[PDB]
Amino acid sequence: ELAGASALDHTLYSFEPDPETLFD
Amino acid sequence: SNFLIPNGTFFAVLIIFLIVLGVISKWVVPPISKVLAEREAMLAKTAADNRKSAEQVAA
Amino acid sequence: AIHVGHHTLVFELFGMTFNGDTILATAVTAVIVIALAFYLRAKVTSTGVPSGVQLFWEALTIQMRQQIEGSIGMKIAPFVLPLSVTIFVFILISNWLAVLPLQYGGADGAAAELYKAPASDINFVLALALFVFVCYHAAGIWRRGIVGHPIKVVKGHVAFLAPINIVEELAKPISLALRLFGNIFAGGILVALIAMFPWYIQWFPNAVWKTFDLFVGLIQAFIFSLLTILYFSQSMEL
Amino acid sequence: DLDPNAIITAGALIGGGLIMGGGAIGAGIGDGIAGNALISGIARQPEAQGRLFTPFFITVGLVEAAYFINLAFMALFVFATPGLQ
Amino acid sequence: DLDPNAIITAGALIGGGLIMGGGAIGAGIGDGIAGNALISGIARQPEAQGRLFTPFFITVGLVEAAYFINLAFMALFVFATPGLQ
Amino acid sequence: LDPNAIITAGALIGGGLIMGGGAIGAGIGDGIAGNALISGIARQPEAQGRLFTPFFITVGLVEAAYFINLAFMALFVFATPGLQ
Amino acid sequence: LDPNAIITAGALIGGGLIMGGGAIGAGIGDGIAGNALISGIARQPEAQGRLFTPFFITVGLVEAAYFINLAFMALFVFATPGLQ
Amino acid sequence: LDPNAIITAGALIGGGLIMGGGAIGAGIGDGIAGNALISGIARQPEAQGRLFTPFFITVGLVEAAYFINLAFMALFVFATPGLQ
Amino acid sequence: LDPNAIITAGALIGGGLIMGGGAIGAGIGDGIAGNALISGIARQPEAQGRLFTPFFITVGLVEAAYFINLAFMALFVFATPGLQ
Amino acid sequence: LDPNAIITAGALIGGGLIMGGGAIGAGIGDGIAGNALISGIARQPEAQGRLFTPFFITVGLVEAAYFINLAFMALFVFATPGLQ
Amino acid sequence: LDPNAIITAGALIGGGLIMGGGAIGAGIGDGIAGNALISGIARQPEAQGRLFTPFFITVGLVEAAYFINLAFMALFVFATPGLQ
Amino acid sequence: LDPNAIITAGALIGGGLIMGGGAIGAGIGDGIAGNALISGIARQPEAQGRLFTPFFITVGLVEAAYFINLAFMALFVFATPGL
Amino acid sequence: MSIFIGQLIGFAVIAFIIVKWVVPPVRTLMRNQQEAVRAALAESAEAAKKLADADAMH
Amino acid sequence: DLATFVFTRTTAGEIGILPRHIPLVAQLVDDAMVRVEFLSVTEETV
């Protein structure tokens, strides 16, 4: 989900903090 | 010199447009619809053939 | 010396005045469309490799059907597809043909163009918009009936905003017409205005504006077709 | 000594200029805002454009309604200025 | 000499021009913003639209009102100009 | 030249500006508040009860000014100071 | 032409303009503040009680400007400067 | 005083207002639609093509408004209604 | 026409424009800063103390020009340069 | 009175309106597009190439309107329709 | 009629427009730049320092334009070209 | 009434309007661009150095409209066409 | 005709830009779609062959 | 009901979830406290 909604270079769901932000 | 008032042209131009619709409603759109429909049917039948071959060789 | 309006060729029939130049441009566009239609019919490569004409026409058809389906059932509104593709091709050719360099000196110290885009005349856009209006209102009458359709449109979404709803109906055709007019009319003005500059400086902005005009005509035709399809869909529901 | 009707026509022309200036501002801004919402939604939900189009165009029509009412009134002002002697 | 009534008609016409300019701007902007919100909300959850229409059709009605009533006033500038002799 | 002529012309222009600014302010405020209300209702349906009340504040804080302008525009179109 | 008539007409137009500007400013500000308050409440229903505090702090800063204009607006229309 | 001059100046002012409103609306609407397009592109590069079709619709609307008004200016300045 | 009437009308309209633009700018800027502040407290209540310092910094500056404008407006109405 | 005076003054004011609106629209729309670009860059450092193409697509539209307005002012300023 | 009176009135209206536009621009830009800075500080408490430097870059730009307008309106009101 | 006086008055009003519009555009555009820059720097401080690349374009592509606009105002005031 | 000459020069420049930049990609899409449909037809033919094969083995 | 209210603190900010809250995925702050009357919220339940 979040990875599917994010850059992979480390009924929708609202990701209040930015999806990339949560990964860090 | 208003060039915003409807003119006689209004009717005349309409007529031409009408005939174009008539041409496109019989000699362009229906043939293209048939072509697209038969292409899609070809795709679906080809997928079905590949599958049925799969469970035939399996069968 | 701009001379906005002043149709180059005008005649009289049935006690009514007619604009020869706009009819000429419309006839030329219709002839181009018919030539492409006959070419397609003669070269329908259903099993063979599609040609330029075939691929062009089928691309138009598939796109238009996609918007139609996204709006309303294709079977519910079959005629909408041919009607909308007709409108699209007609408008696109009308606007595109203006790119050809048919502008010269009229011997009056101004610029006159042999070919004037048919949309540049209010009559052309009026005819197209009114035809579309009658068409989709008739489709609504068929779907809902003669009596139900007016009540449905008046009710709209909320009763207490009934006036706006009526305006919306009246806003449908006019909105369609005027924009198209403008989208092309400016071009007719701009090129003429561009002519005021010296030729050796006039050439460049003329080219830039003409490419922008190509883009504008393309987008306007696309939006006109989409608006037609939408208005058809909205008139047929519940 | 100049004709009063000329002054009335000039006033009507300036009035209609304001009419369409405000109408253009409103229509452009409102339509742009609605389009921004449509773009954001379609980006968020990829395939939901088909269903999102109708709510989009509800607002588009609502916005254009005021613009074209102002059109009607601009034509009223200019074509037949109220109380033109 | 100039007819004062012509001056009054011109001034009232310019006033109504301002009236409708402001009304069009406000109605267009309000409709566009309320739309943008509605489009975004429905994009988040399709079924949610069923209810989001309620507040929207309030705000629309609440902004269109500020236009319609405003409209009436500019009619008073033209139909029955106050202080017109 | 009739003085009242210029007085009433200027008054009409001033009232036009009055109502134009009031309509702009009210429309924009209502639109922004409606956008907020839409987003909140979508986010939290049951919050509607606690969302309508705060909303009805800002619109009241907005419409007031607009309606306030009405209360003055009437002046300029029914009793213009300095009319003579 | 009566000098007083022209001066008063200009004053009326200026007052209408200034009131309209204040109308726009107040409407925009109040709508924006209400939008922010509504969004905050939707995020945090329970927060409403504290949220009214900053909101009013903003509202004044907005509302004040509006009412400030009133003063000068009156000075323009009632006590016209430099009136002949 | 050559009423022709008065009507010509009024037509020019009207057309200037037409241009002001149209230019403002077109510029702002285009900016907002482009902002939405760029944000959608950045968040979802894959949607690069898909976002183009709605965006061009929105532009076709906003520009249309401006362009519509343009025609009317051309009507006012070149073939001014009510000329003497 | 006596010059003073013309210069006075021009000055009144000019000052009205001065302080009306000032009012619009101040009101909208206050709305924006208040939105930022109120949302901040809506998110981080304990941050209120560290929010007010930048907040007053911006709003004050927003006021500055507006207040400055008032002075210029007051110059026009009362101290009209070039008055005959 | 000379008709040219009124006609030319009206043309000057109309062209000034045109440029005012054009500048407002171009500046604000271009700023909004740049805001989108900056947000994209900050959230995605490596997207600069992908986001540039939409950017110029927006700018080309926005600036175009402005330049259109620019051109029109020339017509208003240099070769005023109906000048006499 | 005295040409100086007409030219002075025109210059005063011009300065009114100058400062209306300048005030609107300064207020709007400063308010939005504020909002950005306050939001950033809310998100990042310690960042307030490192955020001030870019913020001063923003307000420094807009204010310059505002200040530029001051000079020009001064140039218009105090030293009117072609006053004669 | 001397034609040139009226022409000069109109030209001054037009230039004032032009510069007012230009100031509005420049101020709002610069403020929006700075808002974006501030947000970006808050998100990732190290990004600041690169953020100036697009940012300067925005203002550069915005202030130009103002600066160009400024130039046009000159043509209204210092050289009143058709005086 | 001087305006005519300038207009013709502008149209020539426009045609230059078109043929230089826009024509190649549009023809590329043309060829891609042609080859895609041809590949689909070939795939249909070979799937028919495979069906006949599978029937024969079955 | 999802409880009639779920208070908490997130990286974005404080969040109070009601029964029909829109789906929402967020991270809790380091000193996050949760009251009831990371975080994932679904249409039916938190």
Side-chain angles (χ1 to χ4, degrees):
Chain A
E1 167 164 39
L2 282 193
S6 77
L8 315 175
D9 75 336
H10 201 322
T11 73
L12 266 293
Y13 280 19
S14 52
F15 318 133
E16 268 195 347
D18 273 348
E20 289 290 329
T21 300
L22 283 166
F23 285 87
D24 277 323
Chain B
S1 66
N2 193 352
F3 65 82
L4 265 291
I5 49 166
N7 202 247
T9 304
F10 161 87
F11 286 109
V13 174
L14 185 150
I15 301 299
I16 297 89
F17 187 59
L18 268 171
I19 63 150
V20 180
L21 191 145
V23 167
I24 298 293
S25 314
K26 254 68 173 188
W27 303 340
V28 167
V29 161
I32 289 291
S33 292
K34 183 65 69 65
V35 163
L36 273 169
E38 62 85 19
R39 265 166 72 178
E40 198 285 325
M42 180 224 73
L43 279 167
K45 179 258 280 168
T46 289
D49 272 18
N50 271 316
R51 285 181 57 272
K52 190 265 286 183
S53 296
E55 68 274 15
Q56 276 259 306
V57 61
Chain C
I2 190 77
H3 302 291
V4 174
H6 313 158
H7 278 120
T8 46
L9 314 183
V10 181
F11 59 95
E12 185 65 22
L13 287 175
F14 190 68
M16 181 46 88
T17 318
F18 296 80
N19 307 134
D21 59 358
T22 55
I23 289 285
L24 180 147
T26 310
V28 168
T29 293
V31 175
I32 299 275
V33 162
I34 293 302
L36 291 168
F38 278 25
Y39 195 114
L40 173 76
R41 198 208 81 169
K43 317 298 207 77
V44 296
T45 52
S46 164
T47 53
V49 300
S51 59
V53 178
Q54 173 174 354
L55 195 144
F56 163 81
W57 280 106
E58 76 185 0
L60 268 71
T61 306
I62 184 62
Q63 295 295 344
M64 200 152 283
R65 173 142 55 71
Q66 166 174 5
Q67 292 88 20
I68 294 154
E69 271 297 353
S71 65
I72 197 165
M74 173 65 216
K75 297 288 101 175
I76 297 281
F79 42 71
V80 161
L81 160 57
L83 168 58
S84 291
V85 62
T86 300
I87 295 158
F88 188 107
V89 285
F90 200 46
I91 297 163
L92 195 148
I93 296 300
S94 279
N95 313 137
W96 275 45
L97 291 172
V99 75
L100 311 178
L102 277 296
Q103 186 170 65
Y104 59 95
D108 60 4
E113 53 277 27
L114 172 52
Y115 168 74
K116 294 165 267 293
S120 77
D121 173 11
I122 183 61
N123 297 296
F124 174 90
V125 305
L126 265 168
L128 270 70
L130 271 78
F131 181 47
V132 167
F133 179 93
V134 174
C135 281
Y136 64 63
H137 264 280
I141 287 156
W142 155 88
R143 178 67 159 65
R144 320 188 169 154
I146 190 162
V147 309
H149 185 80
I151 306 306
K152 186 63 65 61
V153 299
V154 165
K155 284 198 166 58
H157 282 304
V158 298
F160 79 89
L161 302 181
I164 294 282
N165 311 146
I166 297 89
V167 176
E168 206 277 323
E169 293 279 345
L170 315 193
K172 283 188 206 293
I174 184 67
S175 73
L176 271 159
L178 303 178
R179 85 180 76 243
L180 167 54
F181 185 24
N183 296 115
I184 310 312
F185 188 14
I189 294 153
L190 269 296
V191 296
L193 196 148
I194 293 150
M196 311 325 188
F197 275 28
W199 71 273
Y200 81 100
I201 295 167
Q202 180 267 358
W203 63 277
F204 157 76
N206 170 275
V208 180
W209 170 255
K210 280 177 98 70
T211 176
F212 196 97
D213 195 352
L214 266 168
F215 157 83
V216 159
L218 170 50
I219 63 174
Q220 188 275 331
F222 154 74
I223 190 167
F224 204 81
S225 315
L226 264 66
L227 296 157
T228 308
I229 299 146
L230 160 62
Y231 294 140
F232 270 106
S233 307
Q234 173 48 54
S235 178
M236 301 156 30
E237 59 85 19
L238 195 149
Chain D
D1 194 5
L2 72 164
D3 312 331
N5 284 324
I7 282 282
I8 293 147
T9 47
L13 260 62
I14 289 160
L18 288 179
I19 299 291
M20 294 298 102
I25 282 166
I29 308 279
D31 291 331
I33 294 285
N36 166 21
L38 181 79
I39 291 275
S40 70
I42 281 171
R44 182 179 306 194
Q45 219 179 337
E47 303 79 359
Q49 66 194 2
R51 70 183 184 86
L52 277 172
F53 265 115
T54 75
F56 181 76
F57 271 97
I58 289 169
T59 298
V60 166
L62 184 67
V63 162
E64 294 297 82
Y67 181 103
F68 296 127
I69 293 157
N70 297 115
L71 182 62
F73 264 50
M74 178 268 256
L76 194 144
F77 274 27
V78 178
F79 292 167
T81 302
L84 183 63
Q85 315 312 282
Chain E
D1 195 45
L2 279 299
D3 162 37
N5 305 271
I7 291 276
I8 307 317
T9 304
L13 290 165
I14 285 162
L18 299 155
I19 302 287
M20 291 305 78
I25 293 162
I29 303 281
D31 291 331
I33 295 280
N36 168 299
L38 180 68
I39 294 89
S40 282
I42 62 178
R44 262 200 267 109
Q45 285 284 41
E47 64 273 19
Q49 81 196 293
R51 56 159 198 286
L52 273 300
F53 284 32
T54 297
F56 160 92
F57 283 120
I58 294 293
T59 313
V60 161
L62 196 149
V63 61
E64 208 64 13
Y67 181 81
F68 279 175
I69 78 184
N70 169 286
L71 173 61
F73 270 96
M74 60 66 72
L76 175 137
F77 269 29
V78 296
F79 274 20
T81 299
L84 179 76
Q85 52 266 31
Chain F
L1 276 300
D2 177 15
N4 277 317
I6 313 312
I7 301 312
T8 47
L12 268 295
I13 287 162
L17 290 167
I18 289 277
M19 269 310 323
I24 292 157
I28 308 292
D30 304 337
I32 293 282
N35 170 8
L37 189 84
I38 284 281
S39 296
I41 292 290
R43 183 177 174 87
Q44 297 200 359
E46 291 85 3
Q48 67 91 4
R50 307 178 199 185
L51 282 165
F52 277 105
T53 49
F55 172 90
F56 291 167
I57 295 292
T58 187
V59 306
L61 185 69
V62 172
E63 298 298 79
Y66 164 65
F67 271 54
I68 286 291
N69 291 318
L70 272 293
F72 293 98
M73 207 273 285
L75 183 63
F76 285 18
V77 302
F78 296 127
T80 316
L83 59 88
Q84 58 200 355
Chain G
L1 275 291
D2 198 47
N4 261 323
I6 310 316
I7 294 150
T8 50
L12 265 295
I13 291 161
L17 186 141
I18 202 69
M19 185 64 72
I24 291 169
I28 301 299
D30 304 342
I32 293 288
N35 171 3
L37 167 68
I38 295 289
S39 59
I41 277 169
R43 208 185 185 85
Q44 288 283 142
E46 181 206 350
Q48 71 275 17
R50 74 154 183 282
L51 273 192
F52 313 131
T53 292
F55 168 71
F56 293 138
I57 297 169
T58 296
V59 163
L61 294 168
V62 185
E63 192 194 1
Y66 194 46
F67 282 75
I68 278 157
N69 286 349
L70 272 290
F72 277 97
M73 177 280 317
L75 177 137
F76 264 110
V77 310
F78 290 102
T80 318
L83 188 57
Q84 283 174 236
Chain H
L1 260 68
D2 183 84
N4 290 305
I6 287 277
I7 182 56
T8 288
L12 278 158
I13 297 291
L17 286 168
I18 301 299
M19 294 298 102
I24 294 154
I28 306 290
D30 285 7
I32 291 156
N35 174 0
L37 177 70
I38 288 145
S39 296
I41 292 279
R43 304 282 161 67
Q44 272 187 169
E46 59 84 21
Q48 178 146 10
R50 167 161 34 80
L51 290 165
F52 270 51
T53 61
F55 163 71
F56 274 10
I57 291 157
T58 284
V59 162
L61 301 177
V62 306
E63 284 285 359
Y66 151 72
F67 273 105
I68 294 156
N69 306 281
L70 198 155
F72 293 160
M73 181 275 288
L75 180 141
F76 284 173
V77 305
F78 297 118
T80 303
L83 269 167
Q84 308 293 55
Chain I
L1 274 296
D2 49 3
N4 263 27
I6 286 282
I7 294 89
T8 45
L12 268 76
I13 300 301
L17 267 74
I18 303 285
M19 182 265 258
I24 290 168
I28 302 163
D30 290 354
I32 297 303
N35 177 332
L37 171 148
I38 185 173
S39 195
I41 296 89
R43 289 201 184 208
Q44 300 150 282
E46 91 299 340
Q48 180 163 31
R50 61 183 179 87
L51 289 184
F52 267 117
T53 289
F55 162 82
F56 285 159
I57 282 157
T58 187
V59 182
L61 190 64
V62 176
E63 302 312 326
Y66 162 50
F67 270 124
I68 285 153
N69 290 318
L70 178 42
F72 271 100
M73 182 265 257
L75 196 151
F76 279 33
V77 305
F78 305 126
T80 316
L83 200 153
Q84 285 175 13
Chain J
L1 270 74
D2 198 10
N4 267 331
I6 294 93
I7 295 145
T8 291
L12 288 153
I13 296 158
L17 266 166
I18 300 166
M19 294 298 102
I24 285 154
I28 299 170
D30 189 358
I32 284 166
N35 167 14
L37 266 296
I38 294 287
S39 302
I41 288 289
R43 307 277 168 113
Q44 293 83 25
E46 51 265 60
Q48 56 262 72
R50 182 170 71 269
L51 308 193
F52 285 165
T53 297
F55 180 32
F56 308 122
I57 287 153
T58 300
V59 167
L61 298 178
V62 159
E63 294 293 328
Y66 178 68
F67 288 125
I68 286 159
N69 292 113
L70 177 148
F72 292 166
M73 182 179 72
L75 178 141
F76 277 48
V77 162
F78 298 115
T80 309
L83 187 67
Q84 52 83 10
Chain K
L1 186 57
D2 190 356
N4 309 270
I6 295 288
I7 293 143
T8 45
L12 265 60
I13 298 289
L17 288 159
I18 293 292
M19 294 299 291
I24 297 169
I28 300 298
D30 263 8
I32 59 186
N35 161 32
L37 173 50
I38 297 89
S39 85
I41 279 165
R43 269 80 158 267
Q44 287 70 223
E46 61 86 20
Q48 65 196 267
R50 60 179 185 76
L51 278 166
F52 275 115
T53 292
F55 165 81
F56 299 142
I57 296 171
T58 307
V59 296
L61 293 173
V62 299
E63 293 306 307
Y66 180 65
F67 282 116
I68 293 169
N69 291 105
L70 294 174
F72 276 54
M73 61 79 71
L75 181 140
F76 273 19
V77 65
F78 302 123
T80 318
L83 189 148
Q84 273 54 80
Chain L
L1 271 294
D2 182 60
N4 278 288
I6 310 311
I7 287 149
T8 298
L12 261 70
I13 288 162
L17 182 61
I18 292 163
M19 291 305 337
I24 295 157
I28 297 171
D30 298 5
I32 279 173
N35 176 311
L37 176 75
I38 292 284
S39 79
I41 287 158
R43 294 296 87 68
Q44 315 293 14
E46 53 255 30
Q48 53 104 16
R50 63 161 201 272
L51 286 166
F52 293 98
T53 291
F55 150 80
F56 270 115
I57 299 167
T58 305
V59 301
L61 200 72
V62 161
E63 285 292 309
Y66 177 48
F67 291 144
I68 291 154
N69 184 278
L70 179 78
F72 271 103
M73 183 278 288
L75 188 140
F76 272 74
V77 299
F78 293 124
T80 60
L83 55 85
Chain M
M1 281 264 187
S2 79
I3 67 189
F4 184 93
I5 288 294
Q7 211 266 317
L8 265 292
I9 297 152
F11 179 78
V13 171
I14 288 288
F16 177 87
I17 298 298
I18 282 291
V19 302
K20 183 156 174 175
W21 276 282
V22 181
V23 159
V26 59
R27 299 308 306 182
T28 308
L29 299 167
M30 186 66 204
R31 294 283 150 79
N32 297 4
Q33 272 272 23
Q34 292 172 312
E35 289 289 82
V37 58
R38 185 225 48 67
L41 176 49
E43 196 263 316
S44 171
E46 72 85 13
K49 174 282 291 183
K50 225 156 170 179
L51 178 145
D53 186 359
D55 303 335
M57 320 305 98
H58 208 61
Chain N
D1 194 344
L2 58 92
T4 67
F5 186 68
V6 174
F7 176 95
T8 178
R9 195 162 173 189
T10 64
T11 57
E14 292 174 8
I15 303 300
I17 298 96
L18 294 174
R20 280 189 289 171
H21 194 296
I22 297 286
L24 188 153
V25 169
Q27 160 164 358
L28 261 56
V29 72
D30 63 358
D31 75 282
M33 181 285 258
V34 181
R35 179 163 30 66
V36 187
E37 290 85 354
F38 274 51
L39 171 43
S40 161
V41 193
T42 316
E43 65 276 3
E44 69 275 16
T45 300
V46 62

